[PDB]
Coordinates of C-alpha atoms and ligand atoms in Angstrom, one line a residue:
Chain A
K1 CA 88.5 91.4 91.2
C2 CA 90.6 94.6 90.3
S3 CA 92.8 93.9 87.4
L4 CA 96.0 95.5 86.4
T5 CA 95.4 94.5 82.4
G6 CA 94.2 97.1 80.2
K7 CA 94.5 101.2 79.5
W8 CA 94.9 103.7 82.0
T9 CA 95.8 107.2 82.3
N10 CA 97.6 109.2 84.9
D11 CA 96.6 112.8 86.4
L12 CA 99.6 113.9 83.9
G13 CA 98.1 112.6 80.9
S14 CA 100.5 109.8 80.5
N15 CA 99.2 106.5 79.1
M16 CA 99.9 103.0 80.0
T17 CA 99.0 99.6 78.5
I18 CA 99.4 96.6 80.6
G19 CA 99.3 93.2 79.1
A20 CA 98.5 89.9 80.8
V21 CA 99.2 89.1 84.2
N22 CA 100.6 85.5 84.4
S23 CA 100.4 82.9 87.3
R24 CA 103.5 84.1 89.0
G25 CA 101.8 87.9 89.0
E26 CA 104.6 89.3 86.1
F27 CA 103.3 91.5 83.5
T28 CA 105.1 93.9 80.8
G29 CA 103.6 96.9 79.0
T30 CA 104.2 100.2 77.3
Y31 CA 104.3 103.9 78.8
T32 CA 103.3 106.6 76.6
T33 CA 104.3 109.7 78.5
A34 CA 102.7 113.0 78.4
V35 CA 105.7 114.9 80.3
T36 CA 108.2 115.8 77.4
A37 CA 108.6 118.4 74.6
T38 CA 107.0 117.5 71.9
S39 CA 108.7 115.1 69.5
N40 CA 107.2 114.0 66.3
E41 CA 108.7 110.5 67.5
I42 CA 106.3 109.0 69.7
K43 CA 107.9 108.8 73.3
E44 CA 107.1 104.7 74.4
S45 CA 109.0 103.0 76.8
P46 CA 108.4 99.7 77.9
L47 CA 107.6 98.6 81.8
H48 CA 107.8 95.6 83.3
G49 CA 106.5 94.6 87.0
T50 CA 104.7 92.2 89.2
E51 CA 101.8 92.1 91.5
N52 CA 101.2 90.3 94.8
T53 CA 99.5 86.8 94.7
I54 CA 99.5 86.2 98.1
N55 CA 95.8 85.4 99.0
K56 CA 94.3 86.3 95.5
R57 CA 93.2 89.8 97.2
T58 CA 91.5 91.2 94.6
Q59 CA 92.7 94.5 95.4
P60 CA 96.6 93.5 95.3
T61 CA 99.6 95.4 95.6
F62 CA 102.0 95.7 92.7
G63 CA 105.1 97.5 91.5
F64 CA 106.6 98.3 88.3
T65 CA 109.6 99.8 86.4
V66 CA 110.1 102.2 83.5
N67 CA 113.3 102.2 81.8
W68 CA 112.9 105.8 79.7
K69 CA 113.6 105.8 76.2
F70 CA 115.9 108.9 75.4
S71 CA 116.8 109.4 78.8
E72 CA 119.4 107.9 81.3
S73 CA 116.6 107.8 84.1
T74 CA 114.4 105.1 85.4
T75 CA 110.9 105.5 87.6
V76 CA 109.5 102.7 89.8
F77 CA 105.9 102.8 90.8
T78 CA 104.1 100.9 93.6
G79 CA 100.6 101.1 94.8
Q80 CA 97.2 99.2 94.8
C81 CA 94.4 98.5 92.4
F82 CA 91.1 99.9 94.2
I83 CA 87.6 99.3 93.0
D84 CA 84.5 101.6 93.9
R85 CA 81.4 103.4 92.8
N86 CA 79.6 100.7 91.0
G87 CA 82.5 99.2 89.9
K88 CA 85.3 101.9 89.1
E89 CA 88.6 100.7 89.1
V90 CA 91.6 103.0 90.4
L91 CA 95.3 102.5 90.8
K92 CA 96.8 104.7 93.8
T93 CA 100.5 104.4 92.8
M94 CA 103.6 106.4 94.6
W95 CA 107.0 106.5 92.5
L96 CA 110.5 107.3 92.5
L97 CA 112.3 109.0 89.5
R98 CA 115.8 108.3 89.4
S99 CA 118.2 110.4 87.5
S100 CA 121.8 109.4 86.4
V101 CA 124.7 111.4 88.1
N102 CA 128.1 110.9 87.0
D103 CA 129.8 111.6 90.3
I104 CA 128.6 109.7 93.5
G105 CA 128.7 112.9 95.4
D106 CA 125.7 114.2 93.7
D107 CA 123.9 110.8 94.4
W108 CA 121.7 112.8 97.1
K109 CA 120.1 114.8 94.8
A110 CA 119.2 112.0 92.2
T111 CA 116.0 111.1 93.6
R112 CA 112.1 112.6 92.9
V113 CA 109.2 111.4 94.4
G114 CA 105.6 111.8 94.4
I115 CA 102.0 110.2 93.5
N116 CA 99.8 109.1 90.4
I117 CA 96.3 108.2 90.3
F118 CA 95.4 106.0 87.1
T119 CA 92.2 105.5 85.7
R120 CA 90.7 103.6 83.1
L121 CA 90.8 105.0 79.5
Chain B
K1 CA 131.7 98.3 83.6
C2 CA 129.3 98.4 86.6
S3 CA 127.1 95.3 86.5
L4 CA 124.3 94.1 88.4
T5 CA 124.8 90.3 87.9
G6 CA 125.8 89.0 91.3
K7 CA 125.6 88.8 94.9
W8 CA 125.1 91.8 97.0
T9 CA 124.3 92.5 100.4
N10 CA 122.6 95.4 102.2
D11 CA 123.0 97.6 104.9
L12 CA 120.3 95.8 106.7
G13 CA 121.6 92.2 106.4
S14 CA 119.3 91.3 103.5
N15 CA 121.0 89.6 100.5
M16 CA 119.9 89.4 97.1
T17 CA 121.0 87.6 93.7
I18 CA 120.6 89.0 90.3
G19 CA 121.0 86.7 87.3
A20 CA 121.9 87.6 84.1
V21 CA 120.8 90.9 82.4
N22 CA 119.6 90.7 78.8
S23 CA 119.6 92.8 75.6
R24 CA 116.7 94.7 76.7
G25 CA 118.1 95.6 80.1
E26 CA 115.9 92.8 82.0
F27 CA 116.9 90.7 84.8
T28 CA 115.4 88.6 87.4
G29 CA 116.5 87.3 91.0
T30 CA 116.1 86.5 94.6
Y31 CA 115.9 88.5 97.8
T32 CA 116.8 86.9 101.1
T33 CA 115.4 89.6 103.6
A34 CA 116.8 90.4 107.2
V35 CA 113.9 92.1 108.3
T36 CA 111.5 89.1 109.6
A37 CA 110.8 87.2 112.9
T38 CA 112.9 84.0 112.3
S39 CA 111.1 81.4 110.1
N40 CA 112.6 78.0 109.7
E41 CA 111.5 78.4 106.6
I42 CA 113.8 80.7 104.4
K43 CA 112.3 83.8 103.1
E44 CA 113.1 84.1 99.6
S45 CA 111.3 86.4 97.4
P46 CA 111.6 86.9 93.7
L47 CA 112.5 90.1 92.2
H48 CA 112.3 91.5 88.6
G49 CA 113.9 94.8 87.2
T50 CA 115.5 96.6 84.4
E51 CA 118.4 98.8 84.1
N52 CA 118.7 101.7 81.6
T53 CA 120.6 100.8 78.1
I54 CA 120.6 104.2 77.2
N55 CA 124.1 104.9 76.1
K56 CA 125.7 101.8 77.8
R57 CA 126.9 104.1 80.7
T58 CA 128.7 101.7 82.4
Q59 CA 127.0 103.2 85.5
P60 CA 123.4 102.8 84.4
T61 CA 120.4 103.7 86.5
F62 CA 117.7 100.6 87.5
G63 CA 114.7 99.6 89.1
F64 CA 113.2 96.6 90.2
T65 CA 110.2 95.2 92.0
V66 CA 110.1 92.7 95.0
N67 CA 106.8 90.8 95.6
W68 CA 107.3 89.8 99.3
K69 CA 106.3 86.1 100.2
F70 CA 104.1 85.6 103.0
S71 CA 103.3 89.2 102.9
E72 CA 100.7 91.3 101.0
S73 CA 103.3 94.1 100.4
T74 CA 105.3 95.0 97.8
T75 CA 108.9 97.0 97.7
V76 CA 110.1 99.0 94.6
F77 CA 114.0 100.0 94.4
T78 CA 115.5 102.4 92.0
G79 CA 119.2 103.5 91.9
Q80 CA 122.6 103.6 90.2
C81 CA 125.5 101.4 90.2
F82 CA 128.7 103.0 91.1
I83 CA 132.3 102.1 90.8
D84 CA 135.0 103.4 93.0
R85 CA 138.3 103.0 95.2
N86 CA 140.5 100.5 93.0
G87 CA 137.2 99.2 91.5
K88 CA 134.3 98.6 94.4
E89 CA 131.0 98.3 93.2
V90 CA 128.1 99.7 95.1
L91 CA 124.5 100.1 94.4
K92 CA 123.1 103.2 96.2
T93 CA 119.3 102.9 96.0
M94 CA 115.9 104.4 97.3
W95 CA 112.8 102.4 98.1
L96 CA 109.0 102.5 98.5
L97 CA 107.6 99.8 100.6
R98 CA 103.7 99.4 100.0
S99 CA 101.5 98.0 102.2
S100 CA 98.1 96.7 101.6
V101 CA 94.9 98.6 103.0
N102 CA 91.3 97.3 102.8
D103 CA 89.9 100.7 102.7
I104 CA 90.6 103.2 100.2
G105 CA 90.5 105.9 103.1
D106 CA 93.9 104.6 104.5
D107 CA 95.5 104.5 101.4
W108 CA 97.5 107.5 102.5
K109 CA 99.3 105.6 105.4
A110 CA 100.1 102.6 102.9
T111 CA 103.7 103.7 101.8
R112 CA 107.4 103.7 103.4
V113 CA 110.2 105.3 102.1
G114 CA 114.0 105.0 102.7
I115 CA 117.4 104.0 101.1
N116 CA 119.8 100.9 100.7
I117 CA 123.2 100.7 100.0
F118 CA 124.5 97.3 98.4
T119 CA 127.7 95.9 98.3
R120 CA 129.3 92.8 96.8
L121 CA 129.3 89.6 98.9
Chain C
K1 CA 119.2 111.9 127.3
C2 CA 119.6 112.4 123.4
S3 CA 119.6 116.0 122.9
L4 CA 119.5 118.2 119.5
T5 CA 121.4 121.5 121.0
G6 CA 124.8 121.5 119.7
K7 CA 126.9 121.3 116.4
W8 CA 126.1 118.5 114.1
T9 CA 127.4 117.6 110.5
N10 CA 126.1 115.6 107.7
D11 CA 127.1 112.8 105.4
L12 CA 127.3 115.4 102.7
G13 CA 129.7 117.8 104.7
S14 CA 126.8 120.5 105.8
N15 CA 127.1 121.8 109.1
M16 CA 124.5 122.9 111.4
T17 CA 123.9 124.5 114.9
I18 CA 120.9 124.0 116.7
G19 CA 120.2 126.4 120.0
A20 CA 118.1 125.8 122.8
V21 CA 115.1 123.5 122.6
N22 CA 112.3 125.1 125.1
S23 CA 109.4 123.8 127.0
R24 CA 107.5 123.5 123.9
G25 CA 109.9 121.6 122.0
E26 CA 110.7 124.6 119.7
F27 CA 114.4 124.9 118.5
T28 CA 116.2 127.6 115.9
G29 CA 119.6 127.2 114.2
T30 CA 121.7 127.9 111.3
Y31 CA 122.6 125.5 108.3
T32 CA 125.8 126.1 106.7
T33 CA 125.4 123.6 103.5
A34 CA 128.2 121.9 101.6
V35 CA 126.1 121.4 98.6
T36 CA 126.9 124.7 96.6
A37 CA 129.2 126.2 94.1
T38 CA 132.0 128.0 96.0
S39 CA 130.8 131.6 97.2
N40 CA 133.2 134.1 99.0
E41 CA 129.9 134.8 100.6
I42 CA 129.1 132.1 103.4
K43 CA 126.1 130.3 102.5
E44 CA 123.9 130.3 105.8
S45 CA 120.3 129.6 106.1
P46 CA 118.1 129.7 109.5
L47 CA 116.5 126.7 110.6
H48 CA 113.3 126.2 112.8
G49 CA 111.7 122.9 114.1
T50 CA 110.3 121.2 117.1
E51 CA 111.0 118.2 118.6
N52 CA 108.4 115.8 120.3
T53 CA 108.0 116.0 124.0
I54 CA 105.2 113.4 124.5
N55 CA 106.7 111.2 127.0
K56 CA 110.1 112.8 127.5
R57 CA 111.7 110.1 125.3
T58 CA 115.3 110.7 125.4
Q59 CA 115.4 109.5 121.8
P60 CA 112.8 112.0 120.4
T61 CA 111.4 112.4 117.1
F62 CA 111.8 115.9 115.3
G63 CA 111.1 117.9 112.4
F64 CA 112.5 121.0 111.2
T65 CA 112.4 123.6 107.8
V66 CA 115.0 125.2 106.0
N67 CA 114.4 128.2 104.2
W68 CA 117.4 128.3 101.6
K69 CA 119.1 131.5 101.2
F70 CA 120.0 132.5 97.6
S71 CA 117.5 130.0 96.3
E72 CA 113.7 129.8 96.1
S73 CA 113.7 126.1 97.7
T74 CA 112.8 124.6 100.9
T75 CA 114.1 121.5 102.9
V76 CA 112.2 119.8 105.4
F77 CA 113.9 117.2 107.7
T78 CA 112.3 114.7 110.1
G79 CA 114.2 112.1 112.2
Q80 CA 115.0 110.7 115.4
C81 CA 118.0 111.4 118.1
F82 CA 119.7 107.8 118.8
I83 CA 122.5 107.3 121.5
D84 CA 124.8 104.4 121.3
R85 CA 128.1 103.2 121.5
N86 CA 129.4 104.5 125.0
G87 CA 127.2 107.3 124.3
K88 CA 127.5 108.8 120.6
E89 CA 124.8 110.5 119.4
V90 CA 123.4 110.2 115.9
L91 CA 120.3 112.0 114.2
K92 CA 118.8 109.6 111.4
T93 CA 116.8 111.8 109.0
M94 CA 115.0 111.6 105.9
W95 CA 114.1 115.2 104.2
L96 CA 112.2 116.4 101.2
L97 CA 113.6 119.3 99.1
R98 CA 110.7 121.4 97.5
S99 CA 112.0 123.2 94.3
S100 CA 110.0 126.1 93.1
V101 CA 107.8 125.8 89.9
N102 CA 106.0 128.8 88.2
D103 CA 103.3 126.4 86.7
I104 CA 101.3 123.9 88.3
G105 CA 101.7 121.3 85.5
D106 CA 105.3 121.0 86.8
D107 CA 104.6 120.5 90.3
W108 CA 104.8 116.6 90.0
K109 CA 108.6 117.1 89.5
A110 CA 109.4 119.7 92.2
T111 CA 110.2 117.1 95.2
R112 CA 113.1 115.6 95.9
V113 CA 113.8 113.1 99.0
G114 CA 117.0 111.1 100.5
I115 CA 118.4 110.6 103.9
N116 CA 120.9 112.3 106.0
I117 CA 122.8 111.1 109.0
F118 CA 124.1 114.1 111.1
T119 CA 126.9 113.3 113.9
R120 CA 128.5 115.6 116.5
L121 CA 131.2 118.0 115.4
Chain D
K1 CA 99.9 137.2 95.8
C2 CA 99.3 133.4 97.6
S3 CA 99.0 133.6 101.2
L4 CA 99.4 131.0 103.7
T5 CA 97.8 132.8 106.3
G6 CA 94.2 131.3 107.0
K7 CA 91.9 128.1 107.2
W8 CA 92.8 125.3 105.0
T9 CA 91.5 121.5 104.9
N10 CA 93.0 118.5 103.3
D11 CA 92.1 115.7 100.9
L12 CA 91.7 113.7 104.1
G13 CA 89.6 116.1 105.9
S14 CA 92.3 117.5 108.8
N15 CA 91.9 121.1 109.0
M16 CA 94.8 123.7 109.7
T17 CA 94.9 127.2 110.7
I18 CA 98.0 129.3 110.0
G19 CA 98.4 132.7 111.5
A20 CA 100.5 135.7 110.6
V21 CA 104.0 135.2 108.6
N22 CA 106.4 137.8 109.8
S23 CA 109.1 139.7 108.1
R24 CA 111.2 136.5 108.5
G25 CA 109.0 134.3 106.8
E26 CA 108.0 132.2 110.1
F27 CA 104.5 131.2 111.1
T28 CA 102.5 129.2 113.8
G29 CA 99.3 127.4 113.6
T30 CA 97.3 124.7 114.7
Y31 CA 96.2 121.0 112.9
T32 CA 93.1 119.3 113.5
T33 CA 93.7 116.0 112.0
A34 CA 90.8 113.9 110.7
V35 CA 93.0 110.5 110.9
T36 CA 92.4 109.2 114.3
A37 CA 89.9 107.1 116.5
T38 CA 87.1 109.5 117.9
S39 CA 88.4 111.1 121.0
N40 CA 85.8 113.2 122.8
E41 CA 89.0 115.0 123.3
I42 CA 89.7 117.5 120.3
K43 CA 92.9 116.2 118.6
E44 CA 94.9 119.6 118.1
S45 CA 98.5 120.1 117.6
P46 CA 100.6 123.0 116.8
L47 CA 102.6 123.4 113.7
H48 CA 105.7 125.6 113.0
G49 CA 107.1 126.6 109.9
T50 CA 108.6 129.1 107.4
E51 CA 108.2 130.3 104.1
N52 CA 110.8 131.4 101.1
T53 CA 111.1 135.1 101.0
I54 CA 113.6 135.0 98.3
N55 CA 112.3 137.3 95.6
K56 CA 108.4 137.9 97.2
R57 CA 107.4 135.1 94.7
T58 CA 103.6 135.4 95.4
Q59 CA 103.6 131.3 95.1
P60 CA 106.5 130.7 97.7
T61 CA 107.8 127.4 98.8
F62 CA 107.3 126.5 102.6
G63 CA 107.8 124.0 105.1
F64 CA 106.3 123.1 108.6
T65 CA 106.3 120.7 111.3
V66 CA 103.7 119.2 113.2
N67 CA 104.6 117.7 116.5
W68 CA 101.5 115.4 117.1
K69 CA 99.7 115.3 120.6
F70 CA 99.3 111.9 122.3
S71 CA 101.6 110.3 119.7
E72 CA 105.5 110.1 119.7
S73 CA 105.5 110.9 115.9
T74 CA 106.3 114.2 113.9
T75 CA 105.2 114.9 110.5
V76 CA 106.8 117.5 108.1
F77 CA 105.1 119.3 105.3
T78 CA 106.7 121.1 102.3
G79 CA 105.1 122.5 99.2
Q80 CA 104.0 125.6 97.5
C81 CA 100.9 128.1 97.2
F82 CA 99.5 128.0 94.0
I83 CA 96.7 130.4 92.8
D84 CA 94.2 129.8 89.8
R85 CA 90.8 129.5 88.4
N86 CA 89.5 133.3 88.8
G87 CA 91.7 133.3 92.1
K88 CA 91.6 129.9 94.1
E89 CA 94.2 129.4 96.2
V90 CA 95.8 125.6 96.6
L91 CA 98.4 124.5 98.6
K92 CA 100.2 121.3 96.8
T93 CA 102.4 119.6 99.4
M94 CA 104.1 116.5 100.2
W95 CA 105.0 115.2 103.6
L96 CA 107.1 112.6 105.7
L97 CA 105.3 111.0 108.8
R98 CA 108.3 109.9 111.3
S99 CA 107.5 107.5 113.8
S100 CA 109.3 106.6 116.8
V101 CA 111.3 103.5 117.1
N102 CA 113.1 102.1 120.3
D103 CA 116.0 100.6 118.6
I104 CA 118.1 102.1 115.8
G105 CA 117.9 98.4 113.6
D106 CA 114.2 99.7 113.1
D107 CA 114.9 103.2 111.9
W108 CA 114.9 101.9 108.4
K109 CA 111.2 101.5 108.6
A110 CA 110.0 104.4 110.7
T111 CA 109.0 106.9 107.8
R112 CA 106.1 107.2 105.6
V113 CA 105.5 109.4 102.5
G114 CA 102.5 111.0 100.8
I115 CA 100.9 114.0 99.4
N116 CA 98.3 116.6 100.8
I117 CA 96.6 119.1 98.6
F118 CA 95.1 121.8 100.9
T119 CA 92.3 124.1 100.0
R120 CA 90.6 127.0 101.8
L121 CA 87.8 126.5 103.9
Ligands
55R1 O1 112.6 111.6 79.7 C1 111.6 111.2 81.0 C2 112.3 111.4 82.2 C3 111.5 111.1 83.1 C4 110.0 110.6 82.8 N1 109.1 110.7 83.9 N2 108.0 110.5 83.9 C5 107.3 110.3 85.1 C6 107.8 109.9 86.3 C7 107.2 109.9 87.2 C8 105.6 109.8 87.3 C9 105.3 109.9 86.0 C10 105.7 110.1 85.2 C11 104.9 110.1 83.6 O2 105.7 110.3 82.6 O3 103.7 110.1 83.6 C12 109.7 111.0 81.5 C13 110.2 111.1 80.2
55R2 O1 107.4 90.7 104.7 C1 107.8 91.6 104.5 C2 107.5 93.0 104.3 C3 108.4 94.0 103.8 C4 109.7 93.5 103.7 N1 110.5 94.6 103.6 N2 111.9 94.4 103.1 C5 112.5 95.7 102.7 C6 111.7 96.9 102.3 C7 112.8 97.9 102.0 C8 113.9 97.8 101.7 C9 114.8 96.9 102.4 C10 114.1 95.6 102.5 C11 114.9 94.6 103.0 O2 114.4 93.4 103.4 O3 116.0 94.5 103.0 C12 110.2 92.4 103.9 C13 109.4 91.3 104.6
55R3 O1 120.3 126.6 97.0 C1 120.4 125.4 97.7 C2 119.2 124.8 97.5 C3 118.9 123.3 98.0 C4 120.1 122.8 99.1 N1 120.0 121.7 99.7 N2 120.3 121.2 100.7 C5 120.3 119.9 101.3 C6 119.2 119.2 100.9 C7 118.5 118.2 101.4 C8 119.4 117.5 102.5 C9 120.7 118.2 102.5 C10 121.1 119.4 102.0 C11 122.1 120.0 102.8 O2 122.7 121.1 102.2 O3 123.0 119.3 103.4 C12 121.2 123.7 99.4 C13 121.3 125.1 98.7
55R4 O1 98.7 110.6 116.2 C1 98.7 110.7 115.0 C2 99.6 110.5 114.2 C3 100.3 110.7 112.8 C4 99.2 111.6 112.3 N1 99.5 111.9 111.2 N2 98.4 112.6 110.3 C5 99.2 113.4 109.0 C6 100.5 112.7 108.5 C7 100.6 113.1 107.3 C8 99.6 113.6 106.5 C9 98.5 114.1 107.0 C10 98.2 113.9 108.2 C11 96.9 114.4 108.9 O2 96.3 114.2 109.8 O3 95.9 115.0 108.0 C12 97.8 112.2 113.1 C13 97.9 111.7 114.4
NAG5 C1 96.6 109.2 75.9 O1 95.1 108.6 75.0 C2 94.3 109.7 74.8 C3 92.9 109.1 74.5 O2 93.4 108.2 73.3 C4 94.4 110.9 74.1 O3 93.3 112.0 74.1 C5 95.9 111.4 74.6 O4 96.5 112.4 73.9 C6 96.8 110.3 74.8 N1 98.0 110.9 75.5 C7 99.3 110.4 75.0 C8 100.3 111.0 76.1 O5 99.5 109.8 74.1
NAG6 C1 123.5 86.4 103.8 O1 124.8 85.9 103.4 C2 125.8 86.0 104.5 C3 127.1 85.3 103.9 O2 126.6 84.2 103.1 C4 125.4 85.5 105.6 O3 126.3 85.9 106.9 C5 123.8 86.2 106.1 O4 123.4 85.4 107.3 C6 123.0 86.0 104.9 N1 121.9 86.5 105.2 C7 120.9 86.2 105.1 C8 119.5 87.1 105.7 O5 120.4 85.3 104.6
NAG7 C1 132.0 122.5 108.8 O1 132.9 122.5 110.2 C2 134.3 121.7 109.9 C3 134.8 121.9 111.2 O2 134.9 123.2 111.5 C4 134.8 122.3 108.8 O3 135.9 121.2 108.2 C5 134.2 122.4 107.2 O4 134.8 122.9 106.4 C6 132.8 123.2 107.4 N1 131.8 123.2 106.4 C7 131.0 123.7 106.0 C8 130.5 123.6 104.8 O5 131.3 124.9 106.4
NAG8 C1 87.0 120.8 109.6 O1 85.9 122.2 109.7 C2 85.0 121.7 108.7 C3 84.3 123.0 108.5 O2 84.1 123.4 110.0 C4 84.3 120.4 109.3 O3 83.1 120.1 108.5 C5 84.9 119.3 109.8 O4 84.1 118.5 110.3 C6 86.2 119.7 110.4 N1 87.2 118.5 110.6 C7 87.9 118.4 111.7 C8 88.6 117.1 111.5 O5 87.9 118.9 112.7

C-alpha cells in the first residue's frame, strides 16, 4: 500500500505536504519550494491532484497541479508511487513548468520539462 | 477576458467540459476522449485543475489532471488561454501521459509527451 | 518514399535545408531560425542527424542536433516523415532545447520542450 | 575542461563510447543499451552528435542522435557536461524516444521523454 498522504521532499530541497485522498482519488496540499531568491515571506503554494483508483493498485499513478504564488506560472507533475527496500516509499515524477507569455508567437518557448524524485521527510 | 469555463475540443477530436472556476482558481470537468477502441460504453473521465490568479491576467496559465477510466494511467495538461482574431479563444497546452509500470526498472519508459490545441465547440 | 533531403519550413517561420542522406542514414544541413532579434548578420547554424534505416520504411524516424551560433544552447529534434494528400510530405517533430547553466543546481531548469511541423518550401 | 570523449554509463546500465570531438564540435560513437530482452547478438547502435563550441565553455551543451538497431525508433539526447567533487565528470541529459507509427493519427502518442545521468566508466 503506497500512499501519497504525508510529507515529501524532492531532489531540489522543495517540501510538499499532501492531505487525505478521498473516495474519488482527489487530494489537496501545499508546496514549499527551494527554488527562489530568499524571501522573508515563506513561499507556499497550494496543490491539487488526483490519483488513479482503477484497480486499487497500491502503486498508483497520479497527477497534480501547482499554481505558483508570486508568479504567473503553473507546474504540473505526474508519476507513480513505488515501495521498496524493506518498505521505503518513493514518488518518481516528471513535470511541465508553464510560463506565461504575452504574445502567442512566444508560446513555443513557454514550457520546461524535467524529473523530480520525492522521498518521505 | 480568456475563460476556461465552457466546451472545448482538441486537435485529436477529444471533447472536454470545464465548469465554473472559483475564487481560488479551481475547476472541475469531464473529458471525453477520441483516442480509444470504440466502446458502446461512453468513455468519460473527470478532470481537476487550477488556473493562475496572480494578477487577473485575462490570459492565465493553468494546469489540470485527468484520471483515466478503464485505464491505470494519468495525463496532466498545462498551458495558457489565448484570445485573438476578433475574439477567438484558444488553449495551447502540453501534456504528460503517465502509464503504470509494475517494476521500478521500467519507470524510465512510462512517460509520453506532446501538445494539444483546444478550441471552443 | 518520404525523403528528408530538401528545403523545409516550420510553423515558426524557421527554414532548414538538409542535404543527401547516405547509406548509413547520416545527413547534414543548415538551420536558419526565425526566433531571434533581427541581426543584419544572417543567423545560420549547422545541423547533423540520422534517420532510421531499419526496413527502408519510406516513413522513417529520425533525429538531429542543432548547435546554435551566437548562443551556448543546443536543440535536438526527433520525429517521422509522413506522406499524404496526393503526396504532400510533412515532418512531425518534437524537440528539446537545452540551455547552458553555470551551476549544476540550476540544471533542473535548463530544458524546454515542444513540437515543430515542417513542410516543404 | 569537461570532455565528452570517453566511456560512460547511464543510470539504466547502458554503456556508450564517444570518440574524438573535432574542430566543429562533431563526434561519433556507439551505444550499448541495457534496456532489451537478452540477445546473444550484442545490441550496439551508432550515435552522432555535436557539442557547442561557442566560447570553449569547458562545460558545454551538446546533443546527439541514436539510431536504434533492430528497431524502427530513434532517441535524441541533449544536455551538459558538468565537473565537480575533486574533478568527477557527469553528463546530465534529457531525451526524447521517438517510435514509429504507420498512420499519422497515432503521431500524438509516439514520443517518450525522460532523463539520463551518465558517469565515467
Ligand atoms: O516562482 C516560481 C516559478 C516556478 C517554480 N517552479 N518550481 C518547480 C518546478 C518544477 C519542478 C520542481 C519545482 C520546485 O520548486 O520544486 C517555483 C517558483
Ligand atoms: O485509456 C486511455 C489512456 C490514455 C488516454 N490519453 N488521452 C490523451 C492523452 C494526452 C493528450 C490527449 C489525450 C486525449 O484523449 O485527448 C486516453 C485513454
Ligand atoms: O539563439 C538561439 C537559441 C535557441 C534557438 N532555438 N530555436 C528553436 C528551438 C526549438 C524549436 C525550433 C527552433 C527554431 O529556431 O525554429 C534559436 C536561436
Ligand atoms: O530497441 C530499442 C528501442 C529504444 C531504446 N531506447 N533506449 C533508451 C532510450 C532513452 C534513454 C536511454 C535508453 C537506453 O537504452 O539507455 C533501446 C532499444
Ligand atoms: C523542508 O523541510 C526540512 C526539514 O524540516 C528543512 O531542513 C528544509 O529547510 C525545508 N525546506 C524548505 C524549502 O522549506
Ligand atoms: C465531440 O463533440 C462533437 C460535437 O458535439 C462531436 O461531433 C464529436 O463526435 C464529439 N466527440 C467525442 C469523442 O465525443
Ligand atoms: C525562409 O524562406 C522563405 C522563402 O524563401 C522566406 O519568405 C522567409 O523569410 C525565410 N525565413 C528565414 C527566417 O530566413
Ligand atoms: C557496461 O560495462 C560494464 C563494465 O564493463 C559492464 O559491467 C556492463 O555489463 C556493461 N553493460 C552493457 C549493457 O553492456
